[PDB]
Structures are given as structure tokens and as C-alpha cells.
Amino acid sequence: AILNILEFPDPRLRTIAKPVEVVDDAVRQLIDDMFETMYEAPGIGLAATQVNVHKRIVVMDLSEDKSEPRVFINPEFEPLTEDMDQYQEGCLSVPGFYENVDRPQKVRIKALDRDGNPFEEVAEGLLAVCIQHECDHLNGKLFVDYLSTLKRDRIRKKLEKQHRQ
Numbered sequence: 138a139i140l141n142i143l144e145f146p147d148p149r150l151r152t153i154a155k156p157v158e159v160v161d162d163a164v165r166q167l168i169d170d171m172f173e174t175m176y177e178a179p180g181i182g183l184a185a186t187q188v189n190v191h192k193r194i195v196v197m198d199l200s201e202d203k204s205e206p207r208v209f210i211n212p213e214f215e216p217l218t219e220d221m222d223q224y225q226e227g228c229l230s231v232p233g234f235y236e237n238v239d240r241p242q243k244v245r246i247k248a249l250d251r252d253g254n255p256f257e258e259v260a261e262g263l264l265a266v267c268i269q270h271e272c273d274h275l276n277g278k279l280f281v282d283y284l285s286t287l288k289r290d291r292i293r294k295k296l297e298k299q300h301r302q
């Protein structure tokens with residue numbers, strides 16, 4: 138099923154996602170619904186908070202053809218270096234707006250696959266940025282919180298106008 142994606146300034150997007158203790162069927166079903174919604178969007182990633190399910194579950198596919206489905210459950214990453222990188226990020230929950238967000242270049246991801254088995258990895262490029270952009274969703278953050286107050290408000294207003302209109 139294609140799922141509904143909440144948008145700024147929906148306060149629900151500020152909910153802090155709770156840890157997935159077990160990976161039952163209900164969880165895998167959600168995962169699939171999350172992939173579909175993401176492809177349908179279209180986006181290269183999606184966290185459960187964006188669709189009103191507040192569990193630590195991140196879905197991703199950083200490829201052209203839909204051949205690289207990646208699942209990140211109970212994720213967490215660590216900057217292995219003091220290095221930074223500027224990237225113009227957009228978000229399905231902040232549609233139409235794209236701002237250059239500054240984030241660490243090399244991070245070490247740590248999660249549980251679709252089955253719930255721990256795995257560790259080292260991210261760079263698009264994956265690093267993406268898991269960071271997704272782990273923010275689980276904590277209630279949006280790339281727009283790295284933006285100025287006036288710039289972010291100019292955005293909050295536009296959407297609040299678009300939304301109901």
C-alpha cells in the first residue's frame with residue numbers, strides 16, 4: 138500500500154521514534170508499504186516517522202533502477218572524521234524546498250537488516266548523507282532545522298498556505 142506522508146509543519150513529524158525490539162510480519166509489511174510509498178513519491182529514502190509510524194525503521198534505495206533496496210532498523214551512526222560536506226538536500230516532508238545542508242563526510246552506520254541482524258558499515262557519498270537525513274527523522278529533526286529562523290519560517294508559512302488552500 139502507498140502510505141500518506143506527513144509534511145512540515147505537522148507537529149507529528151517531531152515525534153521521537155521508538156526502537157524496534159522485534160521484526161515480526163507487521164514490521165515487514167510496513168517496510169514494504171514504506172518502499173512502495175518511497176518509490177511512488179519518488180524519494181531515495183524514507184523513515185517511519187514521515188508516515189506516522191514512530192518506530193526506528195529507515196528504508197532506502199540509492200540507485201537508478203529499483204534494484205538496491207536497503208533496510209535500516211534501529212539505526213545509529215558515528216562521524217569517524219572531523220570532515221564536513223555541503224549537499225543540497227530536499228525532503229518528501231518539506232516538498233519543493235532544497236537547502237544546502239552541511240554534514241560529516243564519513244560516518245559509521247550501525248543497524249539491523251530486514252531480519253533484524255546487527256551489521257556495521259562505513260558510509261561516504263550519498264549513503265552517509267542519507268542515513269543522517271533519515272536518523273534525524275527518528276529524532277524529530279528536518280533539514281530545515283539547520284536553516285535560519287527567518288528562512289525556515291518563510292518555508293513554514295508557504296507550506297501552511299499551500300496545505301490548506
Ligand SMILES: CCCCC[C@H](CC(=O)NO)C(=O)N[C@H](C(=O)N1CCC[C@H]1CO)C(C)C
Nearest residue numbers: 180181182183225226227228229230266267270
Ligand atoms: C539526504 C538526501 C535526501 C534524503 C532523502 C529524501 C527523501 C526523504 O524525505 N527522506 O527522509 C530525498 O529523496 N530527497 C531528494 C533529494 O534531495 N535528492 C535526490 C538525490 C539527490 C538529492 C537532490 O540533489 C528530493 C529530490 C526529494
Ligand SMILES: [Zn+2]
Nearest residue numbers: 227228229230
Ligand atoms: Zn526526509
